[PDB]
Amino acid sequence: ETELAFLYERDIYRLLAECDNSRNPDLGLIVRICLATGARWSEAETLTQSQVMPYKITFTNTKSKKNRTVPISDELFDMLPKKRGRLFNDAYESFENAVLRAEIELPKGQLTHVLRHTFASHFMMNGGNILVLKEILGHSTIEMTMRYAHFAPSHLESAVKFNPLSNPAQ
Amino acid sequence: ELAFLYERDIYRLLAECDNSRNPDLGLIVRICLATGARWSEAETLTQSQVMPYKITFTNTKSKKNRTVPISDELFDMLPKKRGRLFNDAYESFENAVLRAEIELPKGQLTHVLRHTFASHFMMNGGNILVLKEILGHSTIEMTMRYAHFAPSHLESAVKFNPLSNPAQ
Ligand SMILES: [Mg+2]
């Protein structure tokens, strides 16, 4: 399955609706965190109150350079549970269930990465700087982010707009 | 270590060029500073490679071919002749740089104008991927050497994410 599947707006909103009606009250938020930051499933699922701060989230695996801080909206921040320790319980099993109700087809074993793919896909499609994206997802190399480059609306007419000759930066 | 020029240097360079015995020096320079063309790519530019508001550079080692758009004002001031548009402005270039009191590490002269284009392109908010094509970089690695000029804006994640602003 050569394709890195991602959801489109319509899917995205139908998935959320189903997630928000999941018998697991934490799913919605976990999915949202993922869509909003591009975090890996576990990264958002195991989130602790100390990674959350007024308008941003920090992800870390081992102190061994895996410390990323991804900015979120006031809206999302305000939705997060105020309690200490782990904000949510495990919710993966409930996810599979929601995705099915939303009529979402995905390649074998892709349910886990789909949200991250979606985030990156749209980020780039929205004109996001691939260099910023590499940091957000926490890739050790830019080659890893290159998988999302084709989404970037390329417009070479910028050479006239950004060249030193007509528009010197300094 | 790659050297590039700043506005003040650029204005003094153009000035020393608009005084060169070689009438082409100033033109070739403007080309490199607007497209990032290697020196030779612009120096040997032939009339057919030019088209209204875009230039097509070609084969260096690999038979390359890319087309960098340009401004009407740059085009409008190009030789309307045929065949090679200019002569050999390299020695004239060195002359101008020296007269401008511009110091550069060994052999940086051939690419300095292109470095300048890249650096400023990136500084001006240019898309690294676009810059990649513009310079004919086979690998994004080569282009990465300009990444540090890119203004980092992680707040953008708040406006580009599919939860709040799905592209479609
Ligand atoms: Mg099962």
Ligand SMILES: [Mg+2]
């Ligand atoms: Mg000589």
